[PDB]
């Protein structure tokens, strides 16, 4: 279908074990012949006719037989409704949870595309900073053909610095992907936890007292007392079997009522907080991406002030100090650490690993 | 103080590294003599007097000296304000985060006491179920002195079943504690993540163009041009040094404005979602506790129907089947699994491990 759930998430949604039905089975209540009953059309109308207001004969074995059959039908119907109630509870949860899943993965892609949009953009902050304030670092003498050579030496430092921006774009791409993978993994966990939570809290009222009483009257009347054949008050048996069916109807309406009213309150309180924290998953991923970009912005400024200061103070060693600073601090960039100017200063003191081995 | 933070959480709040100041230092801008300036009272009034509307002499070396000193003071003041702005940003975050921490641990104890309240309550569901419907499982004969022996055999089964309730209380206590430890650990992580997030997003405007220009005029005037001693337009130097100070004031107000207005918007959006998901931590812990209690309620009902069915069908083997069912399924209880009646049925078939070795 249009399902976006991963492999293991659809497994957790597919399972139907957590909501467990603890009601008495038919085999504990009725005989195998009574389970395989399926009454004829006339037998049904005879049962339905007991609810009609009437005066009963002191010995009406036809109506007394319908009173026994009414209990068998009432129990069989009660069991079917209970299964349907449970099967209806499972079905609603899957529909609720799959809908929240697909709704959440949809917005996740919107966030994913939005994060890659800003991460593909190249870092120009270092170039802009030097370009706007390079004049305030030129020497005081400012001879005609002396400033042109200072600008050429500056360009060697700036080109060496843009290699750090190139490293920064490589890192922010890798981090953005790691951010996205955390986001989806989190959404997966929310959907998993939500489905199990709704099932885990389903605690319907028990139906033992209603079922056990109905199966006992059947056991008493059918073979021990043989009430239908002996002279016994028919109005007593009809009144007994009628209140027994209503006790079953009360129990089922009490159970279905819990599923419709009280249990539904729980599932909404779950779904709300589930929906709430998915919204947080989005906002969290966005601020993580922002915080990463801020770390790169910090490094460019520190490099910019490192370049401009060394360009004025040590214009002879500037290009070499810039190269050594960028190479010896780039490892800090890929390890996700910050790049302080103290680190840039102390790094320019040492030779790069590339020039030591001679790889370059 | 009244701090409830754990050991490692107060460490994360105490650190002040993540907000990094990248502004130009005084040593890159001024001479060591200019840093150690501390002007006399008359020198200050001379500087402040340049802003007064007046017509300047074509060569006023007294006012021109104050113009140079005004830049030195303007830079020194700018650096102090920038440090204070950062130190003010760190201070507000700690106050904001410690407050949210203590506010959250307070409600956590309220939840902790509330969960232990319901977990200390003993499980009586199995006893209640049998007590209300035991009559509907007595045999049909119902001889005078035959039902009294059936009740005694039932009591042996019920007492054996209350050992499972005793195991259930042991588990729900252990799980409730595990729930509480997860809750506090989660609150710890939220507080940690919140503090670092606010620091990680602080990205103030740079002050390079404003500082570099002011230090350059000082370098030009002081020793290269010697403007104060040579006949040079005084109104030109005052107008130059006045616009330089205002460029510094604009930059500081632009930086402080970001901290007060734009960065504060970020920290509130963080704090809100931080506060939001802590509320979820509470509601999550409560539903986990509920879902545990539901699993125990399921086991009691399955045992209750297992006891009542075996009491009517197999009253001779009931007590032994009950004992074997409870012992062979109790391991499922402590492993956190559900106790289906199918499991209770299949477990009563095998002897208990205790009766095999003879430990009992």
Residue numbers in the entry:
A (entry chain R), B (entry chain R): 33 to 392
Question: How is this structure described in the published paper?
Answer:
To ensure the success of lytic replication, the herpesvirus human cytomegalovirus (HCMV) expresses the immediate-early protein IE1, which acts as an antagonist of antiviral, subnuclear structures termed PML nuclear bodies (PML-NBs). IE1 interacts directly with PML, the key protein of PML-NBs, through its core domain and disrupts the dot-like multiprotein complexes thereby abrogating the antiviral effects. Structural characterization of IE1 has shown that it comprises a folded core domain (IE1CORE), which mediates the interaction with PML and is flanked by a short disordered region at the N-terminus and a longer disordered region at the C-terminus containing a SUMOylation motif and a STAT interaction site. All three IE1CORE proteins display a femur-like structure consisting of α-helices only.
Of the two ratIE1 variants, only the N-terminally truncated variant yielded protein crystals. This variant, covering residues 30 to 392, is from here-on referred to as the ratIE1CORE domain. For crystallization, surface lysine residues of ratIE1 30–392 were chemically methylated. The structure of ratIE1CORE was solved to 3.4 Å resolution with Rwork = 21.5% and Rfree = 24.6%. Initial phases were obtained with the MAD technique since any molecular replacement calculations with the previously determined rhesIE1CORE structure failed. The main chain of ratIE1CORE could be built from residues 33 to 392, and only three N-terminal residues could not be located in the electron density. In case of ratIE1CORE, the correct sequence registration has been corroborated by two additional anomalous scattering experiments, thereby rendering the possibility of registration errors highly unlikely. Thus, helix H1 is significantly shorter in ratIE1CORE, and the position of H2 is rotated by approximately 90° in comparison to humIE1CORE and rhesIE1CORE. Furthermore, a kink separates helices H5 and H6 in humIE1CORE and rhesIE1CORE, whereas ratIE1CORE contains one continuous helix termed H5/6. At the same time, ratIE1CORE has an additional helix H12 at the C-terminus in comparison to humIE1CORE and rhesIE1CORE, which consist of eleven helices in total. However, whereas the stalk and the adjacent C-terminal head region of ratIE1CORE are formed by continuous right-handed coiled-coils, this segment is interrupted by a region of left-handed coiled-coils in rhesIE1CORE and humIE1CORE.
